[PDB]
From a paper:
Here, we investigate Leishmania donovani bromodomain factor 5 (LdBDF5) as a target for antileishmanial drug discovery. LdBDF5 contains a pair of bromodomains (BD5.1 and BD5.2) in an N-terminal tandem repeat. Bromodomains contain ∼110 amino acid residues which fold to form a bundle of four antiparallel α-helices (αZ, αA, αB, and αC), connected in a left-handed topology. Two variable loops (ZA and BC) form a hydrophobic acetyl-lysine binding pocket containing conserved asparagine and tyrosine residues involved in the recognition of the acetyl-lysine substrate.
In addition, we determined the crystal structure of unliganded (apo) BD5.2, enabling comparison with the structure of a BD5.2-bromosporine complex. The two (A and B) chains of BD5.2 in the asymmetric unit can be overlaid using SSM superpose routines to give an rmsΔ of 0.98 Å for 139 equiv atoms. Each chain adopts the canonical bromodomain fold, comprising four antiparallel α helices with a prominent ZA loop (joining helices αZ and αA) containing additional helical elements. Crystals of bromosporine-bound and unliganded BD5.2 are isomorphous, and the two chains in the asymmetric units can be overlaid using SSM superpose routines to give an rmsΔ value of 0.65 Å for 272 equivalent atoms. The clearest difference between the liganded and unliganded BD5.2 structures results from the implied movement of W263 accompanying the binding of bromosporine. In the absence of bromosporine, the side chains of W263 adopt different rotameric conformations and partially occupy the volume taken up by the compound. Significant conformational changes in the surrounding aromatic side chains of Y201 and F256 also accompany bromosporine binding. The conformation of Trp263 in the unliganded BD5.2 structure is similar to that of the corresponding Trp93 in the BD2-bromosporine crystal structure. Overall, we suggest that the bromosporine binding to BD5.2 in the crystal structure is an artifact of crystal packing and that bromosporine is, at best, a low-affinity ligand of this domain.
Author numbering:
A (entry chain A), B (entry chain B): 162 to 300
The structure:
């Protein structure tokens, strides 16, 4: 199948912004909390949020060069975007581990995000129908 | 005319916990984030949250000694509780000053909390009906 366009990838990332999340995954923590940045970066050495992900989508980072677009399964497709989703969730759960509202939100976003990517892959790549889904692998 | 009981004060404070707030105003930021303890104390040196406020209620702080229970207006009643609500709000806004959603939530809570106190005052001191309400004046 043809790779998704960058516009399609941007639309996909845009679709990951849920009003229910209240901008939780869109905020650059290091910029918004300068006095906690060192403490945050200790626990979360790698930045990730939906602003960075939309920049990556717009640039072709998820769909160009060495990026895996279609893998041998749905789960194994759009690996760079899946890794970013996984890092967003990992950072949230690790740093906010003692706050149940945050962890619950993070897990809800994780499941939602992988389902959205799964659906997107299947819309573009019918040859991957019935293979392992990202929603089944990630958790 | 009788001051509220300690149990009534504890129930009032507990009524300030909203499910939708996800523990925003109940979490002890030091306790949930033990390694941020000293950093937080530096930004918000006088902590306030609904757990501390419930403890203060149990200790009789909101109605004993020099406390103003019923003033000349609703807004002028239960001043020590109102002062704690205000500190809770100020600390939230201080810490989250670069995150507009947090500030919006803190201001939403401020109004809700004062209105809860206002309604409580009017149930215990119906003579104050028609006087200035704290929800209008504490902004």
């Amino acid at each position: 199948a043809a790779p998704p366009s960058t516009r399609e990838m941007v639309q996909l990332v845009d679709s990951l912004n849920r009003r229910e999340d209240g901008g939780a995954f869109s905020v650059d923590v290091a910029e918004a909390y300068p006095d906690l940045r060192d403490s945050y970066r200790k626990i979360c050495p790698r930045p990730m949020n939906l602003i960075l992900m939309r920049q990556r989508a717009k640039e072709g980072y998820y769909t160009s060069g060495s990026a895996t677009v279609y893998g041998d399964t749905v789960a194994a497709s759009l690996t760079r975007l899946r890794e970013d989703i996984e890092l967003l969730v990992r950072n949230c759960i690790t740093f906010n581990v003692k706050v149940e509202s945050w962890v619950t939100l993070a897990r809800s976003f994780q499941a939602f995000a992988h389902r959205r990517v799964d659906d997107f892959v299947l819309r573009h790549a019918a040859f991957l129908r019935g293979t392992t889904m990202g929603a089944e692998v990630y958790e």
